[PDB]
Design an enzyme around this catalytic site. Structure first.
Site, short mmCIF file in Angstrom:
data_model
loop_
_atom_site.label_atom_id
_atom_site.label_comp_id
_atom_site.label_asym_id
_atom_site.label_seq_id
_atom_site.Cartn_x
_atom_site.Cartn_y
_atom_site.Cartn_z
N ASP A 1 7.58 30.50 31.67
CA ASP A 1 7.00 29.31 31.04
C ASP A 1 7.22 29.34 29.54
O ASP A 1 7.91 28.49 28.97
CB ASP A 1 5.51 29.23 31.37
CG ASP A 1 4.87 27.90 30.99
OD1 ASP A 1 5.58 26.97 30.53
OD2 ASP A 1 3.64 27.77 31.14
N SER A 2 6.66 30.35 28.88
CA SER A 2 7.05 30.64 27.51
C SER A 2 8.35 31.44 27.51
O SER A 2 8.79 31.97 28.53
CB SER A 2 5.94 31.40 26.79
OG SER A 2 5.73 32.67 27.37
N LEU A 3 8.99 31.48 26.34
CA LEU A 3 10.23 32.20 26.05
C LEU A 3 11.41 31.73 26.89
O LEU A 3 12.40 32.47 27.03
CB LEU A 3 10.06 33.72 26.18
N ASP A 4 11.35 30.53 27.46
CA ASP A 4 12.52 29.85 28.02
C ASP A 4 12.46 28.36 27.73
O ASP A 4 13.28 27.60 28.25
CB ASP A 4 12.64 30.10 29.52
N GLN A 5 11.49 27.94 26.94
CA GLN A 5 11.38 26.63 26.32
C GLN A 5 11.17 26.77 24.83
O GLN A 5 11.38 25.81 24.07
CB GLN A 5 10.23 25.84 26.98
CG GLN A 5 10.13 24.36 26.66
CD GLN A 5 9.01 23.68 27.42
OE1 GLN A 5 8.27 24.33 28.16
NE2 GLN A 5 8.90 22.37 27.28
#
Ligand SMILES: CCCCCCCCCCCCCCCCCC(=O)OC[C@H](COP(=O)([O-])OCC(O)COP(=O)([O-])OC[C@@H](COC(=O)CCCCCCCCCCCCCCCCC)OC(=O)CCCCCCCCCCCCCCCCC)OC(=O)CCCCCCCCCCCCCCCCC
Ligand SMILES: CCCCCCCCCCCCCCCCCC(=O)OC[C@H](COP(=O)(O)OCCN)OC(=O)CCCCCCCCCCCCCCCCC
Lengths: 51, 49, 173, 106, 495, 83, 167, 91, 114, 68, 458
Positions: free
Chosen positions: F38-42
């Site tokens: 969820d974080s660290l790929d957006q």
């Protein structure tokens, strides 16, 4: 030329303001108020000398 | 006509100035003063009254 | 022009430059060229007006006044004699202003002349100027009756205090 | 020529729920933390119902504030709380109250 | 041969006893500073031809800046104190047209508002010293003031000292220069280097035949300039703009010149002004080409090394930065060295020599900070590297300065009539160790810059006292004095 | 003084696909939609343009940035690109 | 704002505050994955206080010691020269009154200027036909249908569709 | 209900009110306002004669001071306006 | 100092039905932009938030006012307070200066101006 | 190439301004300047002290100036 | 005035006698011709005094003051044509005649030769100015402000008739200020205190104090059409010069009770400047500025002893041109934005670049740039009251510091962005907007060339 681009600029107002000072000293009783001689010996402008 | 609304109205100035000397010509009290302004012997303090 | 006794100064006393060195100096190249580029457009035109201004003459005359009464005339509630005395006194005050301006620049003649010593010399202008302005505010400055101009009705009455309270109420001078 | 609720009136308890918002929508339905109860303390010459003060304050500070212009420049519609002190004033930084400058001048 | 002159051209209005007409002054400052002041302005407009090259509003700038020279030049030629008051305010009203060059920008127009605020405190002190000359001295021409020296000059000259604090950036008025930097770059190269800050102390320099006695003056003067040094030293630490780093560094130069008054050294003080005007109008302009090269960061972050096809302007900085270390034999050696070694014979607080000489190191660590962070490390800044250094308009400006810059203190002081007596005694352990104070600043900054670069990874701890990189003065007074007077003390006694 | 056109960003958005070592240079060029990669790929996928472009990346830029060409779309509206 | 995306608003600025303090590039880059291991503490869990206590201790050591004068990316809400280009400042529609021989220049530009106005002069038979329909009563953010169900012109025509370009 | 006038610009120039002879309202205020008052009236008080009898007292002060400096006459007297003309009542 | 300013608090799940306070303003914002976008307006918006601002500030404070409290009579400590104090300074002034001007002298003798 | 069109409000009325400002101020100011030059050259005043003026003094025109 | 009232009364049977719209160009044309006649016969010499003709004129000898009285009537007709042209022609011409009639009483006033003709002319105004507030003004709450425009000036001026006739029957006759040579002194009593009180208090009604001045931001706030008689109300406030006529004599020696007029006008001076930094009105913004440095002159007069009459002569005309010019700025930017509230004017400086120069030099006359006519007199107020005591520079200097902010508080409000609005306010500053904006600094700095005529006796 460097013939009139500077001659209109600087060479013309020289004579006007010098006339405004030669016609000024004879009228105003305090002209240029230049200071003393600061002379250590006595010289040819005077008659005496100094050691 | 000849435009009395125009410059005829500033022509009333000298109409007022012609009346403006009637007060001075009856203020003819003193000639004999000592501010020279003397009216001594001359036709110069007499004039322009 | 003017009169030199009104504006005295000592003589100029300008020494010799004393070059003494065979090195080329620029002062022997400046005064030897720039003097003629000024004298031609100025002095000849000053001469050209000098013959042209002498074409006609015009006169303007001195104004000398007449002073018959001085002070004590006349009686209290009068108008006529107490109007010429105002013309006496008030024109006897605007003269006394610019007399000080002569003595003020007389100090200024000494100060921009010596410069280095400038205090321990000239022997008069720290004294004489303070022998005028000190003898000025007494009896000739209506302090603080200068607002209504004190016209003959307070300038004499400071001098009433300068004779009644002064010099007699010293107990006993 | 707007006469209906043209200004504030002698509040703040003349059915204060009918104040906001029959007009002057400082509160939505009189429970928005901006119902016109905040007449500071009255009796004085302060603000009455006054669509005015103790609403959330201390800065309009020209933020990012993109959903309208809405910060200080670009006229949001009706959110007036206080003015004429804020075109030159701001919010809180990282340090806190500590008056060390008088100790620094010591 | 001297021949100092005054003139008598044209009358102004006259009053009861005094009449002022106009006059001029040609003594030691007109034949000195005016060819210096014009030479800088002659060499500064070619950069603005390149800096303001894309603006159709170019013609207002050369028009507004020339009249700013008029109010800067009529002040030094004056000899009537009325005429000094003309130039004292004429210099500030041009500044609102210079910080307020760029419209909008909700801090910079406030910075124009911050600019004229502190200028008016320096105005109210000068008129207080004016009226005391009216009450006693019967005029306010500068001749008759120096004709007789009064007894109580203590009351007027504090207003002369308070007038100096308005524009010469003393303690208490210190955020005036770090707020004035928000305009264009050669604007601030003029506003901060040779104009708007030399006239704040220049009026004190004219008043030298009076400042000898009245001993309440001299202890207040030298102690004031000592405060101005180290608070600018502690707040310049961890500062992330090039222009702001050079902003503090001219203020610690002011900390020198304030102390040079209390010691009876008039002309050696003014000779430091003669050298200093060369420096930062070069330096902001030399650093201005760097910022225009990247066109938007103006941070000490993301700079790189010196040699990214940048030969010449890096050579121009190290001329300036080594002079800024404290002058071993560079440009201002004949002024900087002859004053801190004139602090040998003195009667100071003795906290003053324990405060002025320490900032000589703090001046030196300003130099390598742009070497070690913008000229030393690996190349890093964002891409599309669009650097450009080829414009002979700029090349004409830099070459004209550095020829005159290096020979500044070495030609002027080479031929001068002497005024005072030198020290000529500088004993053991007391003579040149302030140069050694500059040497260790290279060492101390090395083991902080390299330690922040190559270490055993000192992890970022959130625990630090950071009331040093801010100063805590703009944190509260810009939040309190426009809050108490503006709101509560008004609306209580308003409507 | 140097201008800019559409072709510069069409290099860089496609380049950082291969610069990030987690994403191989075998994906789709302009529309990969990032859920198939969820974080660290957006945030991390645009934390590199925080380094290179870095105009602070506002809060609405996250929910639009799924479609990788819809990343590229509004930059020309922000950066005022040609014609 | 929601609890899950409250993590995202901190996560970008957690690393953005760090590069302010770094001196190298790899020194900052080495602490990217190094700070990621702290973020990899609770990978995927429930949305309750266990996810809030990870944020309740993110109150300290995030605001505590936060960004000593950081990078600002000067074209921003803050930062120097953020709104510097204001001598131009794009006065869109300052060009109504001309009194020509000043409208002599740009002939084809004014011929196209009146052309676009008919798109704005004729939109309220279409935009206001859906403006009464698309808004239910008084509800949320009032953009229209982004194609306007036949042709979206614009809906925000024309002050937003011809908005101010920067230079 | 509401009738009012707006920006008078029917693509003409406009000076005060309208096109013609009200067009002459420009050169009746440009030419009469300045260019005769701001020129001739500015010239009139420029060389205007001696204000409050000053220019006489300029050169009159130049004359009489050196006459006091001539023989014995002191300066800034404040000399009771020719004394022994007042009885000076004591009490 | 001014302020902390408490930029963070708790949620999840305090006051679940408190949301859509933007529905008050977005309806006005829809009423704003529909008024803003039109082919012929040629005038300013009425904007009654500024109408209700100055007129309820410049006027309608004296109809609000009553002197029913002493904190409204508190202006006696600010208006007439220092106004006595400057005269309390100045009445002590100008007479001590006068006694040294009447009895004894201190001035310079060249004080014509003044 | 990079070529666009600059947006100015209007230059017509603004450059129509300063015209009659400059025009009428030279319509009578510059022609009246010659009389300030002609009376300077051909006309003067001389000299002082006093003159005696005969017995009755002169009229008005006691001024040391051309037009005063 | 031999024939000065005489040509200008003939201008009155010319308004309704004339044609249609020619009435504006005709009325301005005749009006400037009197301005030379004003300059010509006046400005004579000059040494105590020029008693002019007779019992109706003393020629304004000590203070000229009369040139400024005659600029304004060929200056406001070009200003009032902004929003007046909506009525019948016979009703518009009446509005022209009443302003011309205002000048004729004030032409005989300021010279007036006497005191019993003074008071009837001192009260000859307030009849035309009041009618201007009633008809063709602005929105409501006019009529109470018309009543506050009365009931103060008339309330204070009535004891002058109690004072003056009490002087006329006692000591001589007050027909002649120059037959005031015999003046008895006035001792401290309990009857003579009131004799000085009624002699002074009526003059504080017009030039205001910290008290009794609430009416002044009513006529300037609720004002006629676009600063029309508001420019005349500038001369109406400064035209209370008659204290210079009266208290120069006629109990001069009562200074024991001068102090509460010194003090009240001094702490009220520093206060009313800061009483407007949170004001929300443009026409009220210049109004409270016009209180402060107009209250500066009062301590220059009750303190006697010139070097105070010098600057106070010039400080009457100081804001008299300046605040008249600021109202011309405020009369503009209202035909284009039909509300006078200053906050709505964000986003200026870009639509009107030509008048932006005129904002600069106007507000540069409050900072006032010491070679002007403003800081040449304020230095003499410094030169007077510092000889009073050493404290007086403090409160008076901060007045020079508060209006430094308070003037630039207006200038920065012009510079903002994107303006949010304004499909109206198109008009790029037409000829009437900028030619009328001229002729204010154009004589002002002209008078700064040789400022010799702006000087009292003094
Ligand atoms: C095609 C070619 C055509 C050829 C044209 C003719 C050639 C040129 C004419 C020659 C020069 C005359 C023009 C006057 C300027 C020079 C004056 C001078 O220095 O001579 C002294 C000479 C003085 O006469 P004087 O014989 O030496 O002694 C008499 C006095 O006692 C002396 O004492 P004073 O009482 O005069 O006191 C000094 C002072 C005092 O005078 C004043 O300031 C009083 C005026 C203001 C009073 C307040 C009014 C407020 C209402 O006077 C001055 O102000 C001198 C400053 C310069 C003149 C001011 C210009 C104003 C415009 O002339 C004057 O000063 C008279 C002033 C009249 C001003 C006229 C201005 C005309 C301007 C025409 C428009 C030109 C525009 C050019 C624009 C070009 C593009 C940018
Ligand atoms: C309250 C009114 C105060 C009046 C008290 C009575 C004054 C009086 O009796 O006259 C004083 C005096 C004349 O009377 P006297 O003392 O006998 O002198 C010898 C001549 N017979 O000498 C005088 O004639 C002095 C004349 C001036 C005093 C009358 C005006 C004083 C009132 C003005 C105060 C301000 C106005 C207040 C009212 C308006 C506001 C509501």
């Amino acid at each position: 030329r460097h013939s009139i681009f500077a001659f209109t600029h600087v060479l013309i107002p020289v004579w006007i303001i010098h006339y405004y000072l030669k016609y000024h000293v004879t009228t105003k009783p305090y002209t240029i108020v230049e200071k003393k001689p600061r002379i250590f010996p006595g010289d040819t402008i005077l008659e005496t000398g100094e050691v | 006509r000849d435009h009395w609304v125009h410059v005829l109205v500033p022509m009333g100035f000298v109409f007022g100035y012609y009346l403006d000397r009637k007060n001075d010509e009856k203020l003819t009290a003193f000639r004999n003063k000592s501010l020279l302004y003397k009216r001594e012997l001359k036709p110069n303090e007499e004039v322009t009254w | 022009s003017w009169d030199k006794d009104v504006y005295p100064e000592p003589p100029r006393r300008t020494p010799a430059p004393s070059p003494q060195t065979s090195l080329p100096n620029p002062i022997t190249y400046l005064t030897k060229a720039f003097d003629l580029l000024v004298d031609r457009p100025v002095t000849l035109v000053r001469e050209f007006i000098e013959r042209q201004h002498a074409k006609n003459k015009y006169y303007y005359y001195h104004r000398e006044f007449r002073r018959v009464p001085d002070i004590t005339e006349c009686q209290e509630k009068d108008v006529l004699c107490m109007f010429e005395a105002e013309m006496q006194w008030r024109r006897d005050y605007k003269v006394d202003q610019e007399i000080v301006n002569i003595i003020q620049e007389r100090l200024k003649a000494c100060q921009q002349r010596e410069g280095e010593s400038h205090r321990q010399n000239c022997a008069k202008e720290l004294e004489q100027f303070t022998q005028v302005v000190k003898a000025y505010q007494d009896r000739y400055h209506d302090l603080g009756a200068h607002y209504s101009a004190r016209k003959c009705l307070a300038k004499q009455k400071q001098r009433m205090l300068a004779e009644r309270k002064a010099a007699k109420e010293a107990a006993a001078a | 020529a707007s006469h209906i609720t043209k200004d504030m009136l002698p509040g703040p308890y003349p059915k204060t729920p009918e104040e906001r918002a029959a007009a002057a929508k400082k509160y939505n339905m009189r429970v928005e933390d901006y119902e016109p109860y905040p007449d500071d303390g009255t009796g004085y010459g302060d603000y009455p119902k006054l669509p005015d003060r103790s609403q959330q304050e201390r800065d309009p500070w020209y933020d990012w504030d993109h959903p309208d212009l809405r910060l200080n420049w670009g006229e949001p519609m009706h959110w007036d709380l206080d003015m004429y002190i804020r075109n030159r004033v701001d919010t809180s930084p990282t340090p806190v109250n500590w008056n060390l400058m008088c100790k620094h001048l010591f | 041969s001297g021949q100092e002159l005054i003139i008598s051209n044209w009358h102004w209005l006259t009053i009861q006893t005094l009449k002022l007409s106009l006059s001029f002054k040609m003594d030691y400052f007109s034949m000195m500073f005016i060819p210096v002041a014009l030479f800088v302005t002659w060499s500064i407009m070619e950069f603005s031809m390149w800096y303001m090259y894309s603006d159709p509003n170019i013609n207002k700038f050369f028009k507004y800046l020339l009249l700013f020279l008029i109010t800067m030049l009529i002040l030094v030629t004056a000899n009537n104190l009325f005429q000094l008051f003309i130039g004292w305010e004429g210099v500030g009203i041009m500044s609102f047209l210079l910080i307020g060059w760029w419209y909008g920008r909700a801090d910079a127009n406030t910075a124009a508002l911050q600019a004229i605020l502190y200028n008016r405190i320096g105005d109210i002190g000068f008129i207080l010293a004016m009226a005391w000359f009216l009450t006693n001295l019967n005029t306010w021409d500068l001749q008759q003031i120096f004709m007789l020296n009064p007894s109580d000059s203590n009351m007027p000259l504090i207003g002369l000292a308070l007038a100096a604090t308005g524009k010469s950036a003393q303690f208490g008025l210190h955020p005036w220069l770090p707020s004035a930097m928000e305009g264009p770059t050669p604007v601030s190269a003029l506003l901060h280097s040779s104009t708007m800050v030399v006239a704040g102390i220049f009026l004190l320099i004219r008043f030298y035949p009076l400042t000898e006695n009245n001993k309440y003056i001299q202890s207040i003067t030298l102690c004031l300039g000592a405060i101005t040094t180290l608070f600018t030293a502690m707040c310049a630490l961890t500062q992330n703009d090039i222009k702001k780093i050079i902003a503090f560094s001219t203020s610690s130069q002011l900390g020198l010149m304030m102390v040079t008054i209390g010691i009876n050294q008039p002309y050696l003080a003014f000779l430091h002004i003669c050298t200093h005007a060369f420096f930062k109008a070069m330096l902001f302009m030399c650093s201005g080409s760097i910022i225009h090269s990247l066109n938007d960061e103006q941070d000490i972050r993301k700079m790189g090394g010196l040699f990214k096809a940048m030969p010449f302007t890096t050579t121009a900085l190290i001329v300036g930065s080594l002079a800024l270390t404290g002058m071993p034999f560079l440009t201002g050696f004949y002024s900087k060295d002859l004053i801190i070694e004139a602090a040998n014979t003195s009667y100071t607080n003795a906290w003053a020599l324990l405060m002025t000489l320490i900032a000589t190191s703090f001046t030196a660590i300003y130099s390598t900070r742009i070497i070690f962070f913008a000229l030393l490390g690996q190349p890093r800044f964002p891409t599309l590297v669009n650097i450009n250094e080829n414009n002979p308009l700029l090349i004409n400006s830099i070459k004209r300065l550095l020829i005159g810059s290096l020979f500044a203190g070495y030609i002027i002081s080479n031929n001068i009539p002497p005024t005072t007596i030198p020290q000529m005694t500088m004993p053991y352990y007391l003579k040149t160790t302030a140069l050694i104070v500059t040497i260790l600043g290279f060492i101390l900054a090395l083991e902080i810059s390299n330690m922040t670069k190559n270490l055993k990874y000192h992890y970022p701890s959130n625990a630090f006292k950071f009331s040093t990189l801010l100063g805590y003065f703009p944190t509260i007074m810009h939040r309190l004095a426009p809050y108490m007077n503006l709101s509560m003390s008004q609306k209580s006694a308003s409507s | 003084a140097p201008p800019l056109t559409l072709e510069g960003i069409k290099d860089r958005v496609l380049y950082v696909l291969k610069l990030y070592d987690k994403i191989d240079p075998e994906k789709l060029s302009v529309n990969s939609h990032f859920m198939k990669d969820d974080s660290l790929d957006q945030v991390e996928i645009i934390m590199a343009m925080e380094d290179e472009f870095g105009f602070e990346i506002p809060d609405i830029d996250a929910e639009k940035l799924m479609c990788p060409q819809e990343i590229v779309d509004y930059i020309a509206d922000k950066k005022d690109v040609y014609e | 704002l929601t609890h899950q995306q409250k993590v995202l608003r901190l996560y970008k600025r957690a690393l953005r505050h760090l590069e302010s303090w770094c001196i190298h590039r790899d020194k900052y880059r080495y602490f990217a994955c190094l700070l990621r291991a702290r973020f990899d503490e609770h990978k995927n869990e429930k949305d309750m206080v266990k996810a809030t206590q990870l944020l309740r201790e993110a109150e300290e050591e995030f605001w505590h010691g936060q960004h000593p004068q950081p990078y600002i990316f000067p074209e921003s809400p803050g930062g120097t020269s953020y709104e510097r280009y204001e001598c131009y400042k794009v006065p869109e529609w300052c060009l109504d009154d001309w009194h020509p021989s000043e409208k002599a220049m740009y002939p084809d530009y004014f011929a196209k200027r009146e052309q676009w106005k008919k798109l704005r002069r004729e939109s309220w038979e279409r935009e206001v036909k859906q403006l009464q329909e698309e808004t239910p009563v008084g509800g949320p953010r009032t953009e229209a249908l982004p194609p306007a169900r036949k042709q979206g012109d614009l809906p925000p025509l024309w002050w937003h569709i011809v908005t101010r370009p920067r230079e | 209900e509401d009738e009012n006038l707006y920006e008078k610009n029917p693509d003409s120039h406009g000076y005060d009110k309208d096109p013609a002879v009200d067009i002459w309202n420009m050169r009746v205020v440009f030419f009469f306002g300045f260019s005769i008052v701001l020129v001739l009236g500015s010239t009139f008080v420029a060389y205007l004669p001696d204000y409050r009898m000053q220019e006489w007292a300029r050169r009159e002060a130049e004359r009489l001071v050196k006459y006091r400096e001539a023989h014995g006459l002191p300066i800034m007297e404040s000399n009771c306006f020719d004394p022994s003309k007042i009885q000076l009542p004591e009490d | 100092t001014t302020l902390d300013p408490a930029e963070y608090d708790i949620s999840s799940e305090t006051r679940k039905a408190q949301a859509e306070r933007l529905a008050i303003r977005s309806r006005l914002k829809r009423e704003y932009q529909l008024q803003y976008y039109d082919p012929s307006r040629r005038g300013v918006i009425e904007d009654p938030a500024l109408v209700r601002w100055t007129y309820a500030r410049s006027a309608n404070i004296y109809p609000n006012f009553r002197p029913n409290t002493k904190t409204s009579l508190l202006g006696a400590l600010f208006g007439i307070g220092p106004l006595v104090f400057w005269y309390y300074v100045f009445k002590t002034d100008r007479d001590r200066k006068e006694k040294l001007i009447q009895e004894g002298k201190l001035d310079r003798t060249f004080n014509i101006s003044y | 190439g990079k070529r666009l069109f600059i947006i100015k409000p209007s230059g017509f009325y603004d450059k129509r301004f300063l015209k009659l400002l400059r025009f009428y101020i030279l319509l009578t100011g510059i022609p009246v300047a010659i009389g300030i030059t002609l009376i300077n050259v051909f006309i003067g005043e001389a000299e002082l002290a006093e003159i005696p003026e005969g017995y009755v003094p002169e009229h008005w025109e006691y001024f040391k100036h051309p037009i005063s | 005035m031999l024939k000065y009232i005489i040509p200008t009364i003939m201008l009155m049977p010319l308004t309704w006698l004339s044609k249609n719209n020619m009435i504006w160009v005709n009325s301005t044309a005749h009006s400037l011709l009197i301005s030379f006649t004003s300059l010509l016969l006046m400005n004579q010499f000059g040494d105590n005094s020029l008693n002019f003709s007779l019992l109706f004129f003393s020629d304004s000898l000590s203070t000229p003051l009369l040139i400024l009285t005659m600029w304004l009537l060929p200056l406001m007709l070009m200003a009032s044509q902004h929003h007046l042209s909506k009525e019948n022609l016979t009703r518009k011409k009446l509005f022209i005649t009443m302003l011309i009639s205002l000048q004729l009483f004030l032409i005989m006033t300021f010279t007036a030769m006497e005191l019993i003709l003074f008071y009837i002319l001192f009260e000859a105004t307030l009849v035309p100015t009041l009618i201007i507030i009633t008809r063709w003004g602005n929105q409501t709450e006019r009529l109470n402000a018309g009543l506050y425009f009365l009931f103060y000036t008339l309330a204070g001026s009535l004891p002058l008739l109690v004072a003056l006739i009490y002087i006329q029957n006692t000591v001589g006759s007050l027909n002649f200020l120059m037959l005031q040579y015999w003046v008895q002194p006035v001792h401290n009593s309990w009857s003579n205190v009131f004799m000085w009180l009624a002699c002074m208090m009526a003059f504080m009604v017009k030039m205001p104090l910290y008290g009794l001045h609430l009416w002044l931001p009513k006529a300037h706030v609720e004002a006629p059409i676009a600063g029309s008689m508001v420019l005349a109300a500038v001369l109406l406030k400064l035209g209370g010069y008659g204290m210079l006529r009266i208290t120069l004599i006629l109990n001069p020696m009562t200074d024991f009770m001068a102090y509460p007029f010194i003090m009240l006008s001094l702490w009220g001076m520093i206060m009313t400047s800061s009483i407007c930094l949170r004001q929300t009105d443009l026409k009220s913004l210049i109004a409270y500025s016009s209180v402060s440095h107009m209250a500066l002159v009062i301590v220059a007069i009750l303190i006697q002893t010139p070097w105070s009459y010098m600057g106070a002569t010039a400080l009457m005309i100081a804001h008299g041109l300046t605040s008249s010019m600021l109202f011309c700025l405020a009369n503009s930017n209202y035909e284009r934005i039909h509300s006078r509230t200053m906050i709505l004017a964000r986003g200026l400086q870009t639509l009107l670049p030509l008048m932006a120069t005129w904002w600069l030099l106007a507000s540069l006359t409050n900072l006032a740039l010491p070679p002007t006519i403003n800081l040449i007199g304020e230095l003499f107020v410094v030169m007077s009251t510092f000889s009073w005591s050493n404290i007086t520079i403090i409160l008076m200097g901060v007045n020079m510091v508060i209006t430094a902010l308070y003037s630039l508080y207006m200038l920065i409000m012009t510079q903002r962005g994107k303006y949010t609005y304004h499909i109206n306010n198109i008009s790029p500053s037409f000829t009437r907007e900028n030619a009328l904006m001229s002729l204010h600094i154009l004589p002002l700095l002209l008078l700064t060339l040789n400022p010799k005529i702006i000087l009292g006796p003094l």
